[PDB]
Amino acid sequence: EYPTVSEIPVGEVRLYQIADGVWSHIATQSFDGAVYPSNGLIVRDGDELLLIDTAWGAKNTAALLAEIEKQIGLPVTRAVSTHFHDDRVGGVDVLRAAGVATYASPSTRRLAEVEGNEIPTHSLEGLSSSGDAVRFGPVELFYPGAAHSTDNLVVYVPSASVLYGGCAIYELSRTSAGNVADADLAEWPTSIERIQQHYPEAQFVIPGHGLPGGLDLLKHTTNVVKAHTNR
Numbered sequence: 001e002y003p004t005v006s007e008i009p010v011g012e013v014r015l016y017q018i019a020d021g022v023w024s025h026i027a028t029q030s031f032d033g034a035v036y037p038s039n040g041l042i043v044r045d046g047d048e049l050l051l052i053d054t055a056w057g058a059k060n061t062a063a064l065l066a067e068i069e070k071q072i073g074l075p076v077t078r079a080v081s082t083h084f085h086d087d088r089v090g091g092v093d094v095l096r097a098a099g100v101a102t103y104a105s106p107s108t109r110r111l112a113e114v115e116g117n118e119i120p121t122h123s124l125e126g127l128s129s130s131g132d133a134v135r136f137g138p139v140e141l142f143y144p145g146a147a148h149s150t151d152n153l154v155v156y157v158p159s160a161s162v163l164y165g166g167c168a169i170y171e172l173s174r175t176s177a178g179n180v181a182d183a184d185l186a187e188w189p190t191s192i193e194r195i196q197q198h199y200p201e202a203q204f205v206i207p208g209h210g211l212p213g214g215l216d217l218l219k220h221t222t223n224v225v226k227a228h229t230n231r
């Protein structure tokens with residue numbers, strides 16, 4: 001029932017219910033000659049919705065907001081981007097134009113700027129160092145250290161024990177690290193552990209690409225990362 005890359009034409013967005021008031025959103029996009037799926041999160045925030053991450057581009061992010069409105073019907077009032085790449089900030093200008101207040105860490109916005117990506121409007125304070133946590137309406141943002149990228153956040157929904165790993169967490173189906181350009185493979189295993197350490201109660205674990213899972217996804221990524229520093 002979880003939608004796969006071949007079932008989502010580029011430009012469409014699926015929503016998938018994970019728990020009460022917690023959905024993921026799944027889109028698809030070309031990168032370097034192939035199309036990949038991508039997840040973010042939607043969390044009910046009282047009478048509003050918090051968005052974790054764009055749907056990877058302006059057209060995708062538009063289709064995201066239209067599906068949200070058709071299937072859920074509450075306004076998206078804020079969004080957080082969890083690192084600076086395009087599958088996370090690409091679409092922030094569409095969100096801004098729709099009326100969404102967009103947020104990321106100061107590191108993330110700096111790095112988006114340097115890279116030429118869309119820049120979320122508002123800075124998130126309190127996340128500067130490996131281990132920091134802040135409350136953000138119905139979720140907790142947490143900086144576990146460098147992994148996929150030096151800025152990558154993860155997100156936890158306490159009410160529903162959902163842990164969103166962003167691109168720092170892989171799906172079991174996946175066995176090569178693939179593009180790790182902006183990564184830090186020395187710190188990545190240690191950063192995955194700070195998560196295991198802070199969220200041992202996590203029932204649902206969502207990587208940035210592919211199928212949801214449980215905490216086993218943590219260890220699975222560590223291994224797939226180590227496999228690439230050895231060779």
Ligand SMILES: CCCCCCCc1sc(N)nc1C(=O)O
Binds near residue numbers: 037148174
């Ligand atoms: C089983 C194949 C699973 C998909 C590989 C993803 C490769 C891409 S594309 C993009 N925008 N981000 C990534 C990433 O690794 O974070």
Ligand SMILES: [Zn+2]
Binds near residue numbers: 083085
């Ligand atoms: Zn990335």
Ligand SMILES: [Zn+2]
Binds near residue numbers: 085087167208209
């Ligand atoms: Zn990614």
